[PDB]
Amino acid sequence: MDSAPCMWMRGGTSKGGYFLRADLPADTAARDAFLLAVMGSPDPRQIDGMGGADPLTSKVAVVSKSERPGIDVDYLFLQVFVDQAIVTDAQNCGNILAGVGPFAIERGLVAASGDETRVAIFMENTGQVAVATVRTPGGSVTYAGDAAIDGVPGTHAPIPTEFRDTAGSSCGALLPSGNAVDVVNGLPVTLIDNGMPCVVMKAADVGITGYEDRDSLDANAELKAKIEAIRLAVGELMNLGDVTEKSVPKMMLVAPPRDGGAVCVRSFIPHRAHATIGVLGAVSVATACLIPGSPAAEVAVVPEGARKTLSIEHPTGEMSCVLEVDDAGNVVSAALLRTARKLMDGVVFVLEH
Amino acid sequence: PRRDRNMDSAPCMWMRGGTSKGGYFLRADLPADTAARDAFLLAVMGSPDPRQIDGMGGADPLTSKVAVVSKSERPGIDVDYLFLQVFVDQAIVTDAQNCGNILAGVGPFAIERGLVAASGDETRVAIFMENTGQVAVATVRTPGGSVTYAGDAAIDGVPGTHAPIPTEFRDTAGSSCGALLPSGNAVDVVNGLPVTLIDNGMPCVVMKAADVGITGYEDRDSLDANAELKAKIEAIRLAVGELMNLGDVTEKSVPKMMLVAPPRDGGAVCVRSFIPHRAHATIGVLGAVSVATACSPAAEVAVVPEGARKTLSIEHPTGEMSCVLEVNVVSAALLRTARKLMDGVVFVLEHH
Ligand SMILES: [Ca+2]
Ligand SMILES: [Ca+2]
Ligand SMILES: [Cl-]
Ligand SMILES: [Cl-]
Ligand SMILES: [Cl-]
Ligand SMILES: [Cl-]
Ligand SMILES: [Cl-]
Ligand SMILES: [Cl-]
Ligand SMILES: [Cl-]
Ligand SMILES: [Cl-]
Ligand SMILES: [Cl-]
Ligand code: NA
């Protein structure tokens, strides 16, 4: 295989290549070798491929028509490492997911349903489902509009994304330790998985305010060591095995809001300070805000009602999460805004094997 | 039918050209008005945006470049080639300089698009470089009449091997300046140290690295942090701009500052190039032609090859670049490679 049809899209704040599953090799070794060559990996500059020399622009979506009930398309996310000959499918990316809906409609995997088309997506990495609402004026996708997200210039068509079946998707339960709060290394934390395994703790409990600049936190070795020691100590409690070399759980340091939101966060993913917050991590953090007695509930401003908009402040702005909660208190769905844009469509080429 | 009514588009081939990357267009496929063309190309790349997240640029000037190619009507020329730099974090598209790396993709692009017919197993493509008025001849491997990008050729800064693209340069004397020696005399002296103002494809100031207080072997960070050195050579550049017929070069990127030193790794010359303020990782393709041509001040340190076809290996930080000169300088040939990465249609949000 020396080529494959491919669409290059921006999905959220990430970028990568979108493939039909039938257009990629069935053998995972042959597939990974093809995608590495497509990106130009391994190479810190990715000069001989389509990767942008950054993990956020070295990503792949594998999309196929789904035989699952109620699901339109299956979606496999793959991170193509920039400077290593490694392609991984552990954990799912909620930004590349934003392009899956429009891509499936454009490719004919899902018929457009009027001027606005809802696409039910099965996320194969963690077995959860997202429903993306795509603008399809006159029966064809558009990527233009008045919606904006932090980290992307200008405005685009909105892609509301509703997540369900998120609780314990990676850890097997919403609270894998069975506790709303666990004391780890002398500090109270919440171990929670509502779409993305997270450790939620007060920024003040680890010696910062939680409003520091991303670059200042990224260079705070003492803080990173304290957080990492906690992350290693809860890997088994969260049913994640040995998390030494894993990118999970994400470390979420929370603080009361300062820009009008519900809560403020600084996220380490697990080592680098995030410029915003992960889309699935936002669902976990927002859900943690609703658990009484937890560090997030202590600092969050939670509105009343069955439908709560939880604006999560992060270094470059805020990401709002709409939580639908039953009369008992359980989060039945979470909806967040993303956008996408088809950038180039055609065929990617690699040198033959 | 079933197209985005709020976007525009054009056919485009994304290629690696040498150590650069960008989009290759047919001239007829872009808007004819400069302003409309520039807005389109900025949107193609996702500029302005330091991350270029909403476009095809790679958040680096070297991966935010454009080639505009068309069938030429100049005598002896196959295609005309306009190089355009799409700025990453500014709403700027410029044609002021000539990239000899994006040039490597032009030949194969022209053949794949049918601008030039394949003449057997190797195809010679005469390329008029409209930015500077120079002519380059690229020899493209076309086995069975089809362009190939696979082969045993290697260049520093690119992993693996690819099909060789030998690129011979003609009409390089005074590409940006009046003639080969813009000042009029060969070895002039500015601020006390002897230099050589020479333009044989890229306007340069050639001078001995010892005459400026360094050895010529330091690393990129150690030279770019050297405020003493950069200030000394910048004052040399700011005092030769009008003398090299370049106007006021305070805001320009030309001429390139070339600090020469004897070779260490077995090459011909070691050079440190400031382009004009950043320490160049390797060396510019056209800059290497000007430096190889400079070899009395450059002859101080040069182990010049012997025969009539000299392979001058110019040692730069990340390795070496070899410039074949035939002798009076007859031709200047350098090795490049290219690869077609993606082919299809690029899309932009409509301007309004
Ligand atoms: Ca329109
Ligand atoms: Ca249009
Ligand atoms: Cl498929
Ligand atoms: Cl990486
Ligand atoms: Cl995500
Ligand atoms: Cl910040
Ligand atoms: Cl990390
Ligand atoms: Cl044309
Ligand atoms: Cl730039
Ligand atoms: Cl060049
Ligand atoms: Cl510079
Ligand atoms: Na279409």
CSV table of C-alpha atoms in Angstrom, one decimal, chain B residues 20-278:
chain,number,residue,atom,x,y,z
B,20,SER,CA,11.0,22.7,3.5
B,21,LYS,CA,7.4,21.8,3.0
B,22,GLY,CA,4.4,23.5,1.4
B,23,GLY,CA,1.7,23.6,-1.2
B,24,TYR,CA,2.3,23.5,-4.9
B,25,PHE,CA,-0.3,25.2,-7.1
B,26,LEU,CA,-0.9,25.8,-10.8
B,27,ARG,CA,-1.0,29.6,-11.4
B,28,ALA,CA,-4.4,29.3,-13.1
B,29,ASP,CA,-5.8,27.7,-10.0
B,30,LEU,CA,-5.2,30.7,-7.8
B,31,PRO,CA,-6.9,34.1,-7.8
B,32,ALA,CA,-5.2,36.5,-10.3
B,33,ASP,CA,-5.4,39.5,-8.0
B,34,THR,CA,-2.5,39.7,-5.6
B,35,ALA,CA,-4.6,40.6,-2.6
B,36,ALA,CA,-7.2,37.9,-3.2
B,37,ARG,CA,-4.3,35.4,-3.8
B,38,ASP,CA,-2.5,36.3,-0.6
B,39,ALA,CA,-5.7,36.1,1.5
B,40,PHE,CA,-6.4,32.6,0.0
B,41,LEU,CA,-2.8,31.4,0.7
B,42,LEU,CA,-2.9,32.7,4.3
B,43,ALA,CA,-6.2,30.8,4.9
B,44,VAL,CA,-4.7,27.7,3.3
B,45,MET,CA,-1.9,27.7,5.8
B,46,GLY,CA,-4.0,28.7,8.8
B,47,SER,CA,-2.2,32.0,9.1
B,48,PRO,CA,-1.9,34.1,11.1
B,49,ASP,CA,-1.6,31.7,14.0
B,50,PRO,CA,1.6,30.6,15.8
B,51,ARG,CA,0.1,27.1,15.9
B,52,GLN,CA,-1.5,27.3,12.4
B,53,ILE,CA,-4.1,25.0,13.8
B,54,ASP,CA,-6.8,25.9,11.3
B,55,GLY,CA,-4.7,25.3,8.2
B,56,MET,CA,-2.1,23.2,6.5
B,57,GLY,CA,0.9,25.1,7.7
B,58,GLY,CA,3.2,23.3,10.2
B,59,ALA,CA,3.6,26.2,12.6
B,60,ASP,CA,7.2,26.9,11.2
B,61,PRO,CA,8.2,29.1,8.4
B,62,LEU,CA,9.9,26.2,6.7
B,63,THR,CA,6.6,24.3,6.5
B,64,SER,CA,4.5,27.4,5.6
B,65,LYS,CA,5.7,27.9,2.0
B,66,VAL,CA,4.0,28.0,-1.4
B,67,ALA,CA,5.1,27.3,-5.0
B,68,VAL,CA,3.1,28.8,-7.9
B,69,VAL,CA,4.0,26.9,-11.1
B,70,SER,CA,2.9,27.5,-14.7
B,71,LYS,CA,4.0,26.6,-18.3
B,72,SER,CA,6.6,29.0,-19.4
B,73,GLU,CA,6.9,30.9,-22.7
B,74,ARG,CA,10.4,32.1,-22.1
B,75,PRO,CA,12.9,30.7,-24.5
B,76,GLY,CA,14.4,27.4,-23.3
B,77,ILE,CA,12.3,27.4,-20.1
B,78,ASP,CA,9.8,24.7,-19.3
B,79,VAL,CA,8.0,26.2,-16.3
B,80,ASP,CA,7.9,29.5,-14.4
B,81,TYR,CA,8.1,29.2,-10.6
B,82,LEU,CA,7.1,31.8,-8.1
B,83,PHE,CA,8.1,31.1,-4.5
B,84,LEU,CA,5.9,32.6,-1.7
B,85,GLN,CA,6.6,32.6,2.0
B,86,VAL,CA,3.4,32.5,4.0
B,87,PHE,CA,4.2,34.1,7.4
B,88,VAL,CA,3.1,32.0,10.4
B,89,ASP,CA,2.0,34.6,12.9
B,90,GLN,CA,1.5,37.6,10.6
B,91,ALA,CA,-0.9,38.2,7.8
B,92,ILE,CA,1.9,38.5,5.3
B,93,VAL,CA,2.8,36.7,2.0
B,94,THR,CA,6.1,37.7,0.4
B,95,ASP,CA,8.2,36.9,-2.6
B,96,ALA,CA,11.3,38.8,-1.6
B,97,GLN,CA,13.7,35.8,-1.3
B,98,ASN,CA,14.2,32.7,-3.4
B,99,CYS,CA,13.9,29.3,-1.8
B,100,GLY,CA,16.2,26.6,-3.4
B,101,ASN,CA,14.5,23.9,-1.3
B,102,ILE,CA,10.8,24.4,-2.4
B,103,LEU,CA,12.5,24.5,-5.9
B,104,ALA,CA,13.2,20.8,-5.6
B,105,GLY,CA,9.5,19.9,-5.8
B,106,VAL,CA,8.8,22.1,-8.8
B,107,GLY,CA,10.3,19.7,-11.4
B,108,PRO,CA,8.4,16.6,-10.3
B,109,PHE,CA,5.2,18.7,-9.7
B,110,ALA,CA,5.4,20.1,-13.2
B,111,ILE,CA,5.7,16.6,-14.7
B,112,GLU,CA,2.9,15.1,-12.6
B,113,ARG,CA,0.6,18.0,-13.6
B,114,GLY,CA,1.5,17.6,-17.3
B,115,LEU,CA,3.2,20.9,-17.7
B,116,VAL,CA,6.3,19.1,-19.0
B,117,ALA,CA,6.3,15.8,-20.8
B,118,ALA,CA,8.5,13.0,-19.5
B,119,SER,CA,11.5,12.5,-21.7
B,120,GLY,CA,12.3,8.9,-20.9
B,121,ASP,CA,13.7,7.5,-17.7
B,122,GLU,CA,15.1,10.9,-16.5
B,123,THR,CA,13.4,14.2,-17.3
B,124,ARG,CA,15.2,17.6,-17.4
B,125,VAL,CA,13.1,20.5,-16.3
B,126,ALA,CA,14.3,24.1,-16.9
B,127,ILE,CA,12.8,26.3,-14.3
B,128,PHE,CA,12.6,30.1,-14.4
B,129,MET,CA,12.7,31.4,-10.8
B,130,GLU,CA,10.6,34.5,-11.0
B,131,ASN,CA,11.6,35.8,-7.6
B,132,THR,CA,15.2,36.5,-8.6
B,133,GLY,CA,15.2,35.9,-12.4
B,134,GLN,CA,17.5,32.9,-12.2
B,135,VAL,CA,17.2,29.6,-14.1
B,136,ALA,CA,17.5,26.2,-12.5
B,137,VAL,CA,17.7,22.8,-14.3
B,138,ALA,CA,16.3,19.9,-12.3
B,139,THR,CA,16.9,16.3,-13.4
B,140,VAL,CA,13.9,14.2,-12.2
B,141,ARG,CA,13.8,10.4,-12.1
B,142,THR,CA,10.8,9.5,-14.4
B,143,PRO,CA,11.2,5.7,-14.9
B,144,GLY,CA,8.5,4.4,-17.3
B,145,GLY,CA,7.4,8.0,-17.8
B,146,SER,CA,6.1,8.5,-14.2
B,147,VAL,CA,7.8,10.6,-11.5
B,148,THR,CA,9.3,8.6,-8.7
B,149,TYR,CA,10.3,9.9,-5.3
B,150,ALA,CA,12.1,6.8,-4.1
B,151,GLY,CA,15.9,6.4,-4.4
B,152,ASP,CA,19.2,6.2,-2.6
B,153,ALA,CA,19.9,10.0,-2.3
B,154,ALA,CA,20.2,11.6,1.1
B,155,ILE,CA,20.4,15.2,2.4
B,156,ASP,CA,21.0,16.4,5.9
B,157,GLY,CA,17.8,17.4,7.7
B,158,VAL,CA,15.7,14.7,6.0
B,159,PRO,CA,15.5,11.1,7.3
B,160,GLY,CA,15.8,8.2,5.0
B,161,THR,CA,16.6,8.3,1.3
B,162,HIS,CA,14.8,9.5,-1.8
B,163,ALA,CA,15.1,9.9,-5.5
B,164,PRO,CA,17.9,12.4,-6.4
B,165,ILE,CA,17.1,15.7,-7.8
B,166,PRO,CA,20.3,17.3,-9.2
B,167,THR,CA,19.7,21.0,-9.5
B,168,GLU,CA,22.1,23.0,-11.8
B,169,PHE,CA,22.0,26.8,-11.5
B,170,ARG,CA,22.6,29.3,-14.3
B,171,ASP,CA,22.3,33.1,-14.6
B,172,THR,CA,23.1,33.5,-10.9
B,173,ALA,CA,25.5,36.4,-11.0
B,174,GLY,CA,23.7,39.4,-9.6
B,175,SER,CA,20.4,37.7,-9.0
B,176,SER,CA,19.5,40.3,-6.4
B,177,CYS,CA,22.3,42.8,-6.8
B,178,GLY,CA,23.6,44.6,-9.8
B,179,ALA,CA,26.4,42.1,-10.6
B,180,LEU,CA,28.6,39.4,-9.0
B,181,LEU,CA,30.5,42.1,-7.1
B,182,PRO,CA,27.9,44.8,-6.1
B,183,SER,CA,30.4,47.2,-4.6
B,184,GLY,CA,32.6,47.1,-7.7
B,185,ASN,CA,35.8,45.7,-6.2
B,186,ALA,CA,36.3,42.1,-4.9
B,187,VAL,CA,37.6,42.3,-1.4
B,188,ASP,CA,36.2,45.4,0.3
B,189,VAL,CA,36.5,46.2,4.0
B,190,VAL,CA,33.8,47.5,6.4
B,191,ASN,CA,34.4,48.5,10.0
B,192,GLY,CA,38.1,47.4,9.7
B,193,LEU,CA,37.7,43.7,8.8
B,194,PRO,CA,38.0,42.5,5.2
B,195,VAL,CA,34.7,41.2,3.7
B,196,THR,CA,33.6,40.1,0.2
B,197,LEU,CA,30.2,41.4,-1.0
B,198,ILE,CA,29.1,38.7,-3.5
B,199,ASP,CA,25.8,37.8,-5.2
B,200,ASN,CA,25.9,34.6,-7.1
B,201,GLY,CA,22.3,33.4,-6.4
B,202,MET,CA,21.9,34.9,-2.9
B,203,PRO,CA,23.4,38.3,-1.8
B,204,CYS,CA,26.0,37.5,0.9
B,205,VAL,CA,28.7,39.1,3.0
B,206,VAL,CA,31.6,36.7,3.1
B,207,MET,CA,34.3,37.3,5.7
B,208,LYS,CA,36.7,35.4,7.9
B,209,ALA,CA,35.3,34.2,11.2
B,210,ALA,CA,38.6,35.0,12.9
B,211,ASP,CA,38.5,38.6,11.7
B,212,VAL,CA,35.2,39.0,13.7
B,213,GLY,CA,36.5,37.4,16.9
B,214,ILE,CA,35.2,33.9,16.7
B,215,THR,CA,36.6,30.6,15.4
B,216,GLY,CA,33.7,29.6,13.2
B,217,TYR,CA,32.9,26.3,14.9
B,218,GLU,CA,30.5,27.2,17.7
B,219,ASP,CA,26.9,25.8,17.9
B,220,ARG,CA,23.7,27.5,16.9
B,221,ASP,CA,22.7,28.4,20.4
B,222,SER,CA,26.2,29.6,21.4
B,223,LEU,CA,26.4,31.9,18.3
B,224,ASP,CA,22.8,33.1,18.5
B,225,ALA,CA,23.3,34.0,22.2
B,226,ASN,CA,26.6,35.8,21.4
B,227,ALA,CA,25.3,39.4,21.6
B,228,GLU,CA,28.9,40.7,20.9
B,229,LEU,CA,29.2,38.8,17.6
B,230,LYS,CA,25.7,39.4,16.3
B,231,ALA,CA,26.0,43.2,17.0
B,232,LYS,CA,29.3,43.3,15.1
B,233,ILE,CA,28.1,41.5,12.0
B,234,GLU,CA,24.7,43.3,12.0
B,235,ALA,CA,26.6,46.6,11.9
B,236,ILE,CA,28.5,45.2,8.9
B,237,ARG,CA,25.2,44.3,7.3
B,238,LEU,CA,23.5,47.6,8.0
B,239,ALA,CA,26.5,49.4,6.5
B,240,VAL,CA,26.6,47.5,3.2
B,241,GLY,CA,22.8,47.4,2.3
B,242,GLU,CA,22.8,50.4,0.1
B,243,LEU,CA,26.4,49.6,-1.1
B,244,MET,CA,25.2,46.2,-2.3
B,245,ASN,CA,22.3,47.9,-4.1
B,246,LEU,CA,19.8,46.5,-1.6
B,247,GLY,CA,18.3,49.8,-0.3
B,248,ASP,CA,17.7,49.9,3.5
B,249,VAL,CA,18.2,46.4,4.8
B,250,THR,CA,17.2,47.1,8.4
B,251,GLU,CA,13.8,45.3,7.9
B,252,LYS,CA,15.0,43.0,5.1
B,253,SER,CA,16.4,39.5,5.4
B,254,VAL,CA,19.2,40.1,2.9
B,255,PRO,CA,22.2,39.9,2.6
B,256,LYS,CA,23.2,36.7,4.4
B,257,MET,CA,26.2,37.0,6.7
B,258,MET,CA,28.7,34.2,5.9
B,259,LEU,CA,31.5,33.6,8.4
B,260,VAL,CA,34.0,31.2,6.9
B,261,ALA,CA,36.4,28.8,8.8
B,262,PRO,CA,38.7,25.9,7.9
B,263,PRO,CA,36.9,22.5,7.7
B,264,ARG,CA,37.1,19.9,10.4
B,265,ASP,CA,35.0,16.9,9.3
B,266,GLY,CA,36.9,16.5,6.0
B,267,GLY,CA,34.9,19.0,3.9
B,268,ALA,CA,36.1,22.0,1.9
B,269,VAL,CA,35.0,25.0,4.1
B,270,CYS,CA,33.1,25.4,7.3
B,271,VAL,CA,30.6,28.3,7.4
B,272,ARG,CA,28.4,30.0,9.9
B,273,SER,CA,25.5,31.8,8.2
B,274,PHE,CA,23.3,34.4,9.8
B,275,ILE,CA,20.1,34.8,7.7
B,276,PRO,CA,20.4,37.7,8.7
B,277,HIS,CA,20.0,37.4,12.5
B,278,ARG,CA,19.1,33.7,13.1
